[PDB]
Amino acid sequence: MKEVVIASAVRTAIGSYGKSLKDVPAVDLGATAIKEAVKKAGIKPEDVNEVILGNVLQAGLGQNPARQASFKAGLPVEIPAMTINKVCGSGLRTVSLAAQIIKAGDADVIIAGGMENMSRAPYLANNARWGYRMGNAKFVDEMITDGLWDAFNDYHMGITAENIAERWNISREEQDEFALASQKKAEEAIKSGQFKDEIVPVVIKGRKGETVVDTDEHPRFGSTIEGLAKLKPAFKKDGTVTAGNASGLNDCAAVLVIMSAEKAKELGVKPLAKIVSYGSAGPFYATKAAIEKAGWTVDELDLIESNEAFAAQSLAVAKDLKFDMNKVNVNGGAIALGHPIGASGARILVTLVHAMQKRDAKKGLATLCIGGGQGTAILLEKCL
Amino acid sequence: MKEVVIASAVRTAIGSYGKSLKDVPAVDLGATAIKEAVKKAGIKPEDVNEVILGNVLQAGLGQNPARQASFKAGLPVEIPAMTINKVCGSGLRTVSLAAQIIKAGDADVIIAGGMENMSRAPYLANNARWGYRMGNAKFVDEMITDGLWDAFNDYHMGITAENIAERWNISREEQDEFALASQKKAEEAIKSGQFKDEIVPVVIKGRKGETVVDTDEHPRFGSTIEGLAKLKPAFKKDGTVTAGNASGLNDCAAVLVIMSAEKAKELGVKPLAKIVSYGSAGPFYATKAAIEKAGWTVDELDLIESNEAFAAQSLAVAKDLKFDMNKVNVNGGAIALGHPIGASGARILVTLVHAMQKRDAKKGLATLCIGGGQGTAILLEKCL
Amino acid sequence: MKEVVIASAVRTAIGSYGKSLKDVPAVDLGATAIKEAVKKAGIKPEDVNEVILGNVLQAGLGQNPARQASFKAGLPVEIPAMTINKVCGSGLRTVSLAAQIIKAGDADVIIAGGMENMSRAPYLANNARWGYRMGNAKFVDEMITDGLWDAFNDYHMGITAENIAERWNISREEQDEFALASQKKAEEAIKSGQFKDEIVPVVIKGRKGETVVDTDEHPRFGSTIEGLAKLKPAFKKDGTVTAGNASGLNDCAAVLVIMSAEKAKELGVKPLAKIVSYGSAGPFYATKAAIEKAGWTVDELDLIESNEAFAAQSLAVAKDLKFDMNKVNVNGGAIALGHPIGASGARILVTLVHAMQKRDAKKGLATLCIGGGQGTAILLEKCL
Amino acid sequence: MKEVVIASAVRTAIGSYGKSLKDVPAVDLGATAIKEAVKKAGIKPEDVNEVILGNVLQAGLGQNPARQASFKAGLPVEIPAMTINKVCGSGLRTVSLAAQIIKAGDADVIIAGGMENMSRAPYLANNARWGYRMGNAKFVDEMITDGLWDAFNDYHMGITAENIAERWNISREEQDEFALASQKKAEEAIKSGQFKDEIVPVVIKGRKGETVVDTDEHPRFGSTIEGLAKLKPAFKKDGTVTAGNASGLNDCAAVLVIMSAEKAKELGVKPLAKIVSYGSAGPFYATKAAIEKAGWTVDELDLIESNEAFAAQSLAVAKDLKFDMNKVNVNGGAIALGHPIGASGARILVTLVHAMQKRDAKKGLATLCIGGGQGTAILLEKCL
């Protein structure tokens, strides 16, 4: 079984809803990240065998958004590309799929990751083709429907988080303290340059000027516990979940170059980390199973990226798995940084791997999504 | 490494645009085919490790259409699922992905295939979220944009078919004769029961009555060469491509149970065929290379399913690879039967494997899509 | 001051929702009726001083639908035109407005009436211009909102009819018997040619063929009391109002040439009737006051057109004013014939004046709409 | 023939497109103006006989927008109301219609004028009811279609203005100088309080605060000829018409209390002016005809409001009629102040009448719209 490594890991800044990246289609974010990921790996476009990218809000983006990103990045037209939708899991699942294809003997170099522009999601008229006949109907927000709405229970993902808060008995105060810590860690990380290596600038050329976007926009610098304590609940009357202890709606692309170890050696590439194990192979058993498959334990881990869609979910996973919180989300998490759904799993992988390199941490975990069959996790070991 | 087999192969009937399946969401078609594939394979739903389904027109379908199909089929909620979009290749690429995952050692049993309901595609308002400001705008046909429109050339797929017809001198008459033979072959296949093993009925509950859909409705029985010659070009003035020599807009799901040979033995499954090679591993080099990797030649093949999106494109492939037309699309092709894009690759593989069983044909090829990076192909060898 | 006469009165057939006139814009219906009214009056288009037409569902019809009808009819471009919206009263109020303008000394000849195509009403996105921001919204049925929905009570017009039925004890059986008689009377009127003088054919050019629409299509011939008793309440649980005892959604134009008596003499016109009084000059005091202003009583009337939007409302008016039902809606009413809102008041006046001519009835009343400020009524006296 | 007078004249500020009045429905603007007009006339709500209001963009505003405004202003529910659409002519035509009804003997007190909120106009889906079937379609800007688009020539009203510029040979420079003079006069008028009497404040109550809008927003203070000379043409390549020498898209209501002289005497009302004549009764013959009907001449006039939809149109009318430009639009015109189409005619009447009172000008003209059968004009004589 071939060893599989991460050659490069790059992301755009994470934009806020309707703000810095509103005018930049997901496929263009993806192209910008691909082009740079190839350059950082020290390979040529011709060396890439396949492109596999997460994207959740595909509506109206045109045929095969991953292929569009590939093309717009300068990759040969003949490189096959596919777009993967596993909602929250999309961006990380492309990385493990890449590893699987490499293990199967069918490729040596794969561009993986994800892209999302939630700011640009359409509205839909579902019955426009054959007609509404009579009566008011729903003008459907496609971002909510395709990205945020529980298709079975018929409520917002925010309601699942409220149920997890109740079930694990996680208070409003515990959630807001967790949020404030994410905010603080993100602020110092940004100000201390921890994201400078991993972020590729996005250049927006107007008719009249150019704007460069290279900094994560979503963090609220100078956050306070009092500010958080005043917030109104987002999802239900008397809820614990607010806009302040949950992530946002955000825009980003995050891409990694995944290679066999053998090809990386052949191409002179110095790999960042090796992919030791992944969830494909309590209710957080994907994460537990990936750790076990690595032959590791939670105590052994040096750094952990555990996504913060909701503070209540992050805290439940952390209590159940007994994470040392000093090693969790060291540069801030999704409450501060944002949750661009299709790209989010890849984004935290990009952040983990750069953090491992900067901090000399040997063992890393990236985990996100919760609930049976949705959890996605990868274990990384730093290349010496 | 591991040998990979097809345990079962099932599809719904293919509906015509706005007709028999207009009221059945893609996910429900998918669920129907999944449930029956699992039964036909003689395994339990809990023996399934992962679900991978193609679906192109995902807009407004809700989170993770593959997951919804899985759950609606009665598969355990904790089985992971992902939705794949590769446009034309989606349904067949899920089968090779399954084989790759099994080969990597990460699964024994995977549900693969695809689903599409083109009749139900929405219209889109792309700038409803932050506003149109002023001026008329496009009310977007999501089916055309996401499924049928070339994102780089900014024209319809139909133009590509015209381009191929032009470049190869595939005349209107030749395309019409090909279309007629496809029509005649579908009619005889349907009337002789050739699809009865592979079709799972769909049950539609009306207000009073259940309706059963179990027959492919797109074929135009009694078609004639004179009828086809009267039609007007559909895509360009003085063109060759018409409604009559092109496939339709169609609704279907097609699902296969893919397993390791070793797990099939263990579970007492009698498999239908072995997957010998696949495209991921002239301008139709994907298919050529797939054929070579199996150790075969085109002459050695017993049956061939080569998708008919457009007669022009099918005739171009057959000419280039020198197919014996007597072995091609023996039960009719997509011009007669329909082209439900996400499901189509899976649909032709379902029709191939049953036709191999019935006709005692040892070596089979399924191929669809044209152009570098897009060709998808699978070679099958029938099990003793 | 001046006496005011009706020179001519013409209407299109009334189409059913989504049927015979679905392809004919309101303005084209209006143009057809205008052109023929002018011919029937025996005047020249240039003798016309002003055009005043009712139209309720104006959305997306383009600038000044009345003006478009005028111009499409071949009236001189310099004739001023205006579109009036009073919902239910629109078509009849244009006739009294015409009389008022003539009485003020500012015109001799005015085209009045109304037009509506309910089948063609749009759907609306009210927040498309500056954006929805987030969340599902309403895709608005403009026909219901602009035409059928009570803007103060925020319920359907149908609820008002239920309210009246409730308050007056107008039972389901009584409403159904009224509906049946309306059906029977329309059927006999249509079959006996009673509408042949007043209907102008509409010519629809299909791709191959012109189609002629010249017959009211909404009546349900062969209706029976048992058929009506089986229907379910349409507006509220255990209601009295049904599809069967209420009017439909309909398409029509109805136009009258209104002139001073002195100009009619001058131009050699033989007028059909004199306008004696009008509503603008119990809770049906508009009609009562109109009757009194003519110097008349209800008993003195020879024929009455009282609009049937809902049987409940028609029975309430007839009870209160003590109409002799043998003189009411002698050729059938709106339950059978349809209720094209903008045109309806004009339509019933057209049917009244021809019925007076045919039946030699001297004194006529046209009345529609209910509730203070909304009642519209006109009294006619036939010319010798 | 009764004499007819203006008891009161009130308007909201004129808001800019998407700005100060974006959140205030036309009917609420109308209600605010009605309520104040009644108060300023020194009458009670009960003294009003009828409500007649211009409104062009009625789409989705609900049943009978004029009646909604009446109700929301506190006028008795039983007062009849109608909504008039003559596009550009709407707001002034309601005033002459009011005069006609009063002359005919049918009312003593009428609320007239107009209301428009162009910022709130919907987008439309015209084929949503019965379906689009397949293919992209138009998402229709209803403001452009119903308010600004020539229904016959199939181009923007801006193109008519370009044609008038060419026809009368009115240069870009002449147009921009006219615009700059409008801008300057508007700026001094605002700053010198000339609009303080006529403007009623609009109070926008948020969830969290109140905002008061009482000043016209559209003027560009400090305009310069160089600034205007740089502007790009708005409507065609190499055009003379720009955003700087044409009016905007704007929001306003303007209402007047119109009474017989006899009723005004009876109620103790001191009238502002008498309505001497009106266009209902070269290509600017409505204006010429109204002047003649008054028994006046252009030289006799003391003040003139001639609307400035486009500088090119304003200049053509002024050259043809030989206006003394020192008496034209003395407080600025529509280029500076805005063109809220349904209300615009009434707005300039409101401005004329207050200006006549402040400047002691005896004879006034209000004129707007151009082209056969569209021109609307009124002549006023100040009450001593």
Residue numbers in the entry:
A (entry chain A), B (entry chain B), C (entry chain B), D (entry chain A): 1 to 281, 291 to 393
Sentences from the paper on this structure:
Here, we present the crystal structure of C. acetobutylicum thiolase (CaTHL), a type II biosynthetic thiolase that catalyses the first step of n-butanol biosynthesis and condenses two acetyl-CoAs to acetoacetyl-CoA. We reveal that CaTHL, unlike other type II biosynthetic thiolases from aerobic bacteria, is regulated via modulation of a redox-switch, indicating that n-butanol production and the relevant metabolic fluxes in Clostridium are tightly regulated by thiolase. The N- and C-domains form a typical five-layered fold (α–β–α–β–α) observed in other thiolase superfamily of proteins including peroxisomal degradative thiolase from Saccharomyces cerevisiae, β-ketoacyl synthase II from E. coli, and the biosynthetic thiolase from Zoogloea ramigera (ZrTHL)14151617181920.
The 1.77 Å crystal structure of CaTHL was determined to understand the structural basis for its catalytic and regulatory mechanisms. Such disulfide bond formation has not been reported in other type II biosynthetic thiolases. The disulfide bond formation was followed by a large conformational change in the catalytic cysteine loop (CIGGGQG, residues 378–384). The consequence of this conformational change in the catalytic cysteine loop is that the region between β11 and α10 (SAGVDPAIMGYGP, residues 280–292) becomes disordered due to the steric clash. Interestingly, in the oxidized form of CaTHL, the conformational change between the ‘catalytic cysteine loop' and the ‘RDR' forms a hole that enables the cellular reductants to access to the disulfide bond.
